[PDB]
Amino acid sequence: RLSGAGASFPSKIYTRWFADLAKEKGAPRVNYQAVGSGSGRKAFIDETVNFGASDDPMKDKDIAKVKRGLVQIPMTGGTIAFGYNNPGCDLKLTQQKAVEVAMGQVTNWSELGCDDKKLTWAHRSDGSGTTKAFTNSMQAFSKTWTLGTGKSVAWPAGVGGKGNAGVAGVIRNTDGAIGYVNQSYIDENVRAAALQNLSGEFLKPSVEAGAKALNGITLDENLAGTNPNPTAKGAYPIATLTWILAYENGNGRNTKPVKTALSRLLSDEYQDKAPSLGFVPLKGDILEKARGAVERIG
Numbered sequence: 255r256l257s258g259a260g261a262s263f264p265s266k267i268y269t270r271w272f273a274d275l276a277k278e279k280g281a282p283r284v285n286y287q288a289v290g291s292g293s294g295r296k297a298f299i300d301e302t303v304n305f306g307a308s309d310d311p312m313k314d315k316d317i318a319k320v321k322r323g324l325v326q327i328p329m330t331g332g333t334i335a336f337g338y339n340n341p342g343c344d345l346k347l348t349q350q351k352a353v354e355v356a357m358g359q360v361t362n363w364s365e366l367g368c369d370d371k372k373l374t375w376a377h378r379s380d381g382s383g384t385t386k387a388f389t390n391s392m393q394a395f396s397k398t399w400t401l402g403t404g405k406s407v408a409w410p411a412g413v414g415g416k417g418n419a420g421v422a423g424v425i426r427n428t429d430g431a432i433g434y435v436n437q438s439y440i441d442e443n444v445r446a447a448a449l450q451n452l453s454g455e456f457l458k459p460s461v462e463a464g465a466k467a468l469n470g471i472t473l474d475e476n477l478a479g480t481n482p483n484p485t486a487k488g489a490y491p492i493a494t495l496t497w498i499l500a501y502e503n504g505n506g507r508n509t510k511p512v513k514t515a516l517s518r519l520l521s522d523e524y525q526d527k528a529p530s531l532g533f534v535p536l537k538g539d540i541l542e543k544a545r546g547a548v549e550r551i552g
Contacts, residue, residue, distance in 0.1 A: 256511055258286040260294020260307030262418040263384045264330050264496045266438045267531045268307070271519050274527075281518065282511040290417060292381015292405050298499045304508050305516075306499035309383025310405045311478035323502025326476045327547045329519060331468045331534035333459035334388050334492040335440050336447035338432035339425050343368035345432075345447040346456045349395040349483075349491070352449060355432060356392050357399060358411030363430060376424040376433025379414030381405040387480065387494035388434045394483040395491075434492075437464070437532035451491040452483055461529040463490035468534055471495065477543055493534075503552040516548045 258268070265288035272284040289297070291308035298306030299319050307329075317324045336352065338345055340363060347355070347366070354360050355375060363371040378385045382405055389407050392399040401407040415421035415433070422439040425431045432447075437459040440446045448456035457463045467489035471479040483491055498516060505512050518524060525535040536544060 256282045256284040256305070256508065256515060257303045258284060258305045258307055258498075259289050259297045259303045260499070261291045261309050261383050261496055262288040263291075263309045263332060263436045264307065264533070265418075267330055267528055267533050270527065270531070271524050272515075274524065275515060275518050278518065280514075282515050284515055288417060288419070290378070290380040291383035291386070295499070304505065304512055305501075307496070308499060309494055309496040310386040311497050312476060312499065313478065314475075317476070320501070322504035324476070325500045325502050325547050325551055326478060327498045327500060327516060327520075328473070328477055328495045328536060328540055328544050329498045330525075330528055330536065331464060331493065331495045332532060333437045333464040333467070333490045334384055334391070334434055334494070335437055335459050336432060336449060337422060337425050337435045337440055337444040338447055339428060339443055339445070340368060340371060340430055340432075341443070345445075346450075347447045348450045350398065353392050353396040353399045356388075356434070357401070358409065371430040374424075374428050374431040375412035376415055376421050376428070376431050377409045377412050378406070378417075378421060380416050383494070383496065384418060384434065384436055388492060390480060390482045390494075391492040440532070449491055451489050452485050453487050453489070455488070457488070457490045459490050459532060461532060461534055463488060464493050464532075464534045467491065467493035468495060468540075471540075473540065473543065477547060495540075500548075500551055502550065505551065509552060513548055513551050517545065520545050520548060
């Protein structure tokens with residue numbers, strides 16, 4: 255038996271994976287709660303769960319707060335859409351317009367060249383790694399973006415939704431709404447805008463375009479790393495890895511159960527289900543250090 259909490263960004267693929275895991279002989283049963291990366295980090299630091307989940311990765315400065323030591327493990331990757339509700343506007347955003355929308359400077363769909371319609375911008379109200387990676391991209395897109403980058407930013411305008419799900423919910427229910435959600439939340443009537451990358455093509459989120467953005471990330475000493483505006487051809491420009499946070503020591507009789515769950519999720523068998531929900535299978539050096547990292551847990 256195990257509890258995980260954090261990032262909503264990966265929660266659709268983690269839930270499937272944990273369901274699959276739960277049927278294998280001598281596998282643990284894992285409950286994952288999707289409460290956002292800010293809350294998952296605090297669950298982790300407070301020792302209320304067996305592992306955390308976050309798309310805003312820990313650094314040298316905040317691992318002083320993890321008494322039992324921190325093993326930080328890339329689990330999957332994905333893209334962040336400008337999801338929107340305006341049927342019969344095929345929205346195609348330049349990097350500059352993208353920033354202007356996100357900055358609250360676009361109040362009507364006319365300003366994007368679609369028909370006249372009040373535009374509503376939907377952002378996260380909770381601490382969020384999707385917000386972190388999204389604003390990380392907005393920052394590198396244009397100096398028109400003045401808010402910096404973190405799990406929350408000082409949005410000048412728009413509506414708040416709790417979680418990826420809440421943001422998607424607001425877009426679903428609001429004609430003319432537009433906001434940022436992980437690719438797995440593009441469904442029913444939330445459509446993804448085609449977004450301009452630095453090579454000048456306008457791309458929608460996909461496994462392909464996402465893997466091309468995550469390709470060239472060198473990982474640091476805690477396997478954290480980002481590519482805020484990919485120079486690579488075919489790369490969707492807002493992509494990020496996401497991480498499980500596990501205790502180096504102190505797991506006790508849950509040591510083997512943790513190691514097995516993470517090992518199973520890092521197998522080819524599991525990673526190869528990622529594309530079903532728009533996620534990027536980890537392969538190559540990224541995957542290898544992830545598996546290596548798991549094997550260091552005590």
